[PDB]
Ligand binder design. Structure first.
Ligand SMILES: Nc1[nH]c(=O)nc2c1ncn2[C@H]1C[C@H](O)[C@@H](COP(=O)(O)OP(=O)(O)OP(=O)(O)O)O1
Ligand code: NA
Ligand code: NA
Length: 156
């Protein structure tokens, strides 16, 4: 059995558009995603998600709603990534480029799947339908899924 590390992912989903951020530097630059990062000691997962959204995009929100959980396994990495996925309930400011992320709005008929993580093609449609989900994806490298499971759930 493997150990897991907690991460968050936040999607600012509005009726006609979604905010994504492009990772700018280091390895993995060039992919659009929601905003998030590692949960820290003592904070709830939801509070860590709010913190990462603020650090990465400049947006503050009072509340999130949990929509899914996705476990990622990478060949050659013994530690699993346990990603808790949230959507914002309202936003109150403008996104700001940081050094980790360049935020950009996308219309919901222009979701940039080819420039997102491959797994997003599977679970993000559920997110768009306002469904809740559990997923697992095993990757070889950054691009190749070797195994995955995805299930709609009534409770995350
Ligand atoms: N396959 C995948 N699909 C997806 O949709 N999001 C993924 C993903 N793999 C990783 N992520 C997300 C989870 C999280 O939001 C982010 C990874 O977090 P990071 O390691 O950048 O966190 P931190 O910035 O806290 O870490 P440090 O560099 O240690 O500060 O990418
Ligand atoms: Na962090
Ligand atoms: Na990061």
């Amino acid at each position: 059995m493997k150990a897991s590390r907690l991460y968050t992912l936040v999607l600012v989903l509005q009726p006609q558009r979604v905010l994504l951020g492009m990772k700018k530097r280091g390895f993995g630059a060039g992919r659009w995603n929601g905003f998030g990062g590692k949960v820290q000691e003592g904070e709830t997962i939801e509070d860590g998600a709010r913190r990462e959204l603020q650090e990465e995009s400049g947006l503050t929100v009072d509340a999130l709603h949990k929509v899914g959980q996705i476990v990622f396994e990478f060949v050659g990495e013994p530690e699993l990534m346990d990603v808790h996925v949230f959507c914002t309930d309202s936003i109150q400011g403008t996104p700001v480029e940081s050094d980790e992320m360049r935020p950009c709005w996308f219309q919901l008929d222009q979701i940039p799947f080819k420039d997102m993580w491959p797994d997003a093609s599977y679970w993000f449609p559920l997110l768009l339908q306002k469904k809740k989900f559990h997923g697992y994806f095993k990757f070889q490298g950054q691009d190749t899924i070797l195994d995955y499971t995805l299930r709609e759930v009534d409770t995350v």
